[PDB]
RNA sequence: GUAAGAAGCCCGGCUCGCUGGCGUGGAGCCGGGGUGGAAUGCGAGUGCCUAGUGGGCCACUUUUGGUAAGCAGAACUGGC
RNA sequence: UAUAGGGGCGAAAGACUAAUCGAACCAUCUAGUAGCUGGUUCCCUCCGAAGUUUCCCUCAGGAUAGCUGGCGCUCUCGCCC
RNA sequence: CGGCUACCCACCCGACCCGUCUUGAAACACGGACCAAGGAGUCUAACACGUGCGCGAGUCGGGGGCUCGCACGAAAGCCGCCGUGGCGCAAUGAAGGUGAAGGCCGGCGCGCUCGCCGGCCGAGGUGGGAUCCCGAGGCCUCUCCAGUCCGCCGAGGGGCACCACCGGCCCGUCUCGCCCGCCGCGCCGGGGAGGUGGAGCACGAGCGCACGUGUUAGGACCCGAAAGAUGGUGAACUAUG
RNA sequence: AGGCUAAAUACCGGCACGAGACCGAUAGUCAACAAGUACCGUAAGGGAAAGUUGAAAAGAACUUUGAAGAGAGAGUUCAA
């Protein structure tokens, strides 16, 4: 009952700005965005109530 | 009363190998005639070489004893080591020189003869160089050992560097009092 | 059970044979060989005791 | 009491450990014990295989091992009902069941 | 084996081997680390820096398990997968790029090293490097984030 | 219980069983120590020597070969 | 305590974000030239591990307190 | 017959409590700990101390440095310098 | 006839009774009447160092499983899509986290205390450094001539390990300033130049077994107390009803 | 805030059981034996010493001194 399944993938061309777009400042950006994604909310809820 | 001097009678040497190796005492036999008889310095330090423990004969690297090789000069001269020459998984090419050593590994023995090279084992160096003419000698990395990283004067007085024991490398671990200002005095 | 040098062991998993250290271990053959003794200074047999 | 340059040691010998010493003496005791309780159970039980029923395709919960797979303990109620065989019938099959896994 | 002991060797010195006047009878100095603060502190000192005090945060209920990230750099990059697959996968052929994933090989995070020849490849990780990630671009290939 | 207090005696002969050293090796002297504005001349100098050391030396290199 | 040389002496040229009348000064780097540089004796450098020791005493000389001590306490050297 | 162990009893000596009482007897924890006495078992060879610095509720003790032994490694000589 | 000797005696000379506390023992310091047997540095766990062996960026089956039932078999052999796991291959931070390659050449922007494009090399430099390499030179019974022959070296070069210094890279803090990208243009991220703290990198040397030394905790080289706690037994002596 | 349930696990008591790089009558359990026995303390409790003739008693018939213990002859046994 183990079945290590085994996706090989092996035979694929280079492509397209997908290794420009992927860059190391994604996961960064990622992770900036879960430490705010509350604060940025509560300072638009207070610029909706503060007219 | 004669020598005011002290006695010290044996200055530090050891005369015969401590290894019961029958196969290492064979080539202590031949190097020993060899370096008594053929006036080469290169095989007095051979046989000092076998004389010397399994500790102070560190592991060579592949990727060192092509980068040794890799200086003018050093073009059709074999690569003699006294000691064990292993693999190393950075390399990618490996060239076409011939390697005299003890105790080759199998991955290294492998890509060896796959690059096409020739391996060798003492007697045969004997045999194609009594006096060891075309030869470099090459030792190991003896001071990157884990025992030697905890060596100094003192393992933290002038900082000192020298890595004081612990169980965890880590937080609560020795990090308090002479480790930092905060807490009493730092070093 | 073993192989050779050359293959591996077909019944057990990862063994091999050994590294041999001395091939042609003939040693009073090496010693009597030509080229070992073309390279030797000479046979110094004189014992040259103590003179009174 | 302390020396030159060695790890600061703690053992956990202060307490009266030689009454409670667990020596494996008898581990191939226990080695042969659990073959002949193997084998008996082959014998006399049924011809149904060893570790009889069948266990699932599990991931495992972490993000250090959720990478690999694991035998799991039963068929996940909702996964048994789209295959279509009832509870204890499908026991008696040799379908190991566990109320408790979810999809 | 008793035969090799050093006891057997000092059978007729009469102090054995612990002097006739310091007198070595059952724990002079204490037991373990006794006066760590008081009396053995140039042993405590000098050998051991950081042993007294507390240091940082005290995260309750931690696990080793979270923070699993076998981090493998670009020296073991190439050989996760055999030299055969990647010499019969650049040898001339077109500007197709094998993958070479280590989360089968087991690594989380890969980070930058040297060696990392001409030949590009497709890297699949769940993090990297600023440094690993410049080296796959100059060596011309692509960076895949999994999950 | 009045014991002996303290004394020198016996000191320099153990100092001279093994023969009081002078460290006696320094070549290329030790560098910490001096002045950061002494520090910020010197690294810049250097690896401007790294740099911009190339062309000048080799010709004056070739000069002195023909002129001597 | 220091110096009695090849780790030293001199010549030519680069760099400096230090300094600044000045291609001024100072440091670093590169190339070249000649080793016979006080006496005597000795073959040297360095790394690891560790026992015992942590009660001392005497003598020439210089000395502290005491009237003095085979008294108490110091310095060099030697001895137990 | 009643009072049984930090309990009894005492015209009071801290006396008596099974030859033991200013805290009974037997067994267990317990082979309690001791920086404190005494002892520590065959031969030969080589090397070979110290009673000193500093710290400690430290002064009969310990830690550290010094003195010492063992294990080596790097080199150097044997052929006018 | 010769004979040293675990036989006895005599003579000349020297010679206080051993063991240990001590600066000092034959001591008017302590133990020892004599003899036979027993009698004191062991074992486990952990660490460190040295040595020996196997494999070697890997290593290790101690946890289980497989063989036909075997006295030695409570052994041994094997697993490998049983490598789960321990140690090592990456460190630094309290943490969020981050995480070790640079050098050369040509062109471009004011080669501007300044970035980009294309190609090449590749774990940096200096001073020592066993060894190794090229080699002027001269040496062999009468001449021009040669090849191995007897036969070393002035000088030059690449430089193992390691030492000393300089330089570079990574992590957390400090100072100064500019630039870049947008799964969204924000108290978002990233990058540069300097001096610092690290048990780091700067081609890795570990893993397993065994032996030796030292330390720790366990009764821990052997014997030794005044004492504390727990549970029971005694008013047949004595004290008082 | 109600309940049951075999397996892997533990066992120095007990009933038989097999093995030992263990010990050898001052050792090994206190105890190889009429051993928790003799004995001690009012009691709780404490607690020993102690193996070996020979192949088979064939354990010395008979004579003799002494009242016997014992002894000299004689005999059994490879050996008194
Ligand atoms: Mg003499
Ligand atoms: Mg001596
Ligand atoms: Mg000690
Ligand atoms: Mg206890
Ligand atoms: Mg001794
Ligand atoms: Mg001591
Ligand atoms: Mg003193
Ligand atoms: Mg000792
Ligand atoms: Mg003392
Ligand atoms: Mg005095
Ligand atoms: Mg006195
Ligand atoms: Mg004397
Ligand atoms: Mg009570
Ligand atoms: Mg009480
Ligand atoms: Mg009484
Ligand atoms: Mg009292
Ligand atoms: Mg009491
Ligand atoms: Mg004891
Ligand atoms: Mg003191
Ligand atoms: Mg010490
Ligand atoms: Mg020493
Ligand atoms: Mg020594
Ligand atoms: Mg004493
Ligand atoms: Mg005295
Ligand atoms: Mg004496
Ligand atoms: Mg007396
Ligand atoms: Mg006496
Ligand atoms: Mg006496
Ligand atoms: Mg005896
Ligand atoms: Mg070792
Ligand atoms: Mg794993
Ligand atoms: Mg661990
Ligand atoms: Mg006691
Ligand atoms: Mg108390
Ligand atoms: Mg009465
Ligand atoms: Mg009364
Ligand atoms: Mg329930
Ligand atoms: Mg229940
Ligand atoms: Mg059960
Ligand atoms: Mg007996
Ligand atoms: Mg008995
Ligand atoms: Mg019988
Ligand atoms: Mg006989």
Not at chain 2, 43 to 65: A, D, E, G, H, Y
Not at chain 2, 67 to 85: F, H, S, Y
Not at chain 2, 154 to 170: D, F, I, N, Q
Not at chain 4, 7 to 24: S, Y
Request: glycine share 8%; proline share 5%.
């Amino acid at each position: 009952p183990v079945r290590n399944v085994y996706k090989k993938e092996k035979a694929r061309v280079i492509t397209e700005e997908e290794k420009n777009f992927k860059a190391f400042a994604s996961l960064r950006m990622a992770r900036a965005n879960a430490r705010l994604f509350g604060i940025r909310a509560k300072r638009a809820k207070e610029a909706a109530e503060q007219d | 009363g004669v020598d005011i001097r002290h006695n010290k009678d044996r200055k530090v040497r050891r005369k015969e190998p401590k290894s019961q190796d029958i196969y290492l005492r064979l080539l202590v036999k031949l190097y020993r005639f060899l370096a008594r008889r053929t006036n080469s310095t290169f095989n007095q330090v051979v046989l000092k070489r076998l004389f010397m423990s399994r500790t102070n004969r560190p592991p060579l690297s592949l990727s060192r004893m092509i980068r040794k090789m890799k200086l003018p000069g050093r073009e059709n001269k074999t690569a003699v080591v006294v000691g064990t020459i292993t693999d190393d998984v950075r390399v990618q090419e490996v060239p076409k020189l011939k390697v005299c050593a003890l105790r080759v590994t199998s991955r290294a023995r492998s890509r060896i003869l796959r690059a096409g090279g020739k391996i060798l084992t003492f007697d045969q160096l004997a045999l194609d160089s009594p006096k060891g003419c075309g030869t470099v000698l090459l030792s190991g990395p003896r001071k990157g050992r884990e025992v030697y990283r905890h060596f100094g004067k003192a393992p933290g007085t002038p900082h000192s560097h020298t890595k004081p024991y612990v169980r965890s490398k880590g937080r609560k671990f020795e990090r308090a009092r002479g480790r930092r200002a905060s807490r009493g005095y730092k070093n | 059970l073993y192989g050779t040098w050359r293959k591996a062991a077909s019944l057990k998993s990862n063994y091999n044979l050994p590294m041999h250290k001395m091939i042609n271990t003939d040693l009073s053959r090496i010693l009597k060989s030509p080229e070992i003794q073309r390279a030797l200074r000479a046979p110094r047999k004189k014992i040259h005791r103590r003179v009174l | 009491a302390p020396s030159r340059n060695g790890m600061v040691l703690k053992p956990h010998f202060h307490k009266d450990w030689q009454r409670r010493v667990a020596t494996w003496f008898n581990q191939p005791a226990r080695k042969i014990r659990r073959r002949k309780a193997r084998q008996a159970k082959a014998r006399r039980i049924a011809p149904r295989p060893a570790s009889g029923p069948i266990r699932p395709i599990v991931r495992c919960p972490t993000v250090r091992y959720h990478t690999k797979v694991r035998a799991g303990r039963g068929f996940s109620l909702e996964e048994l009902r789209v295959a279509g065989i009832h509870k204890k019938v499908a026991r008696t099959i040799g379908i190991s069941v566990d109320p408790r896994r979810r999809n | 084996p008793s035969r090799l002991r050093k006891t057997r060797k000092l059978r007729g010195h009469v102090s054995h081997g612990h002097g006739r006047i310091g007198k070595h009878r059952k724990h002079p100095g204490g037991r373990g680390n006794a006066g760590g603060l008081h009396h053995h502190r140039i042993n405590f000192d000098k050998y051991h820096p950081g042993y007294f005090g507390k240091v940082g945060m005290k995260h309750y209920h931690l696990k080793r398990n979270q923070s699993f990230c076998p981090t493998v750099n670009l020296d073991k990059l190439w050989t996760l997968v055999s030299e055969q697959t990647r010499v019969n996968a650049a040898k001339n052929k077109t500007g197709a790029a094998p993958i070479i994933d280590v989360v089968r090989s087991g690594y989380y995070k890969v980070l930058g090293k040297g060696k990392l020849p001409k030949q590009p490849v497709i890297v699949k990780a769940k993090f990297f490097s600023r440094r690993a990630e410049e080296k796959i671009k100059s060596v011309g290939g692509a960076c895949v984030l999994v999950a | 219980a009045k014991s002996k207090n303290h004394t020198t005696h016996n000191q320099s002969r153990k100092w001279h069983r093994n023969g009081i050293k002078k460290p006696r090796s320094q070549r290329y002297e030790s560098l910490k120590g001096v002045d950061p504005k002494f520090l910020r001349n010197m690294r810049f100098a250097k690896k401007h020597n790294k740099k911009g050391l190339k062309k000048m030396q080799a010709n004056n290199a070739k000069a002195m070969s023909a002129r001597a």
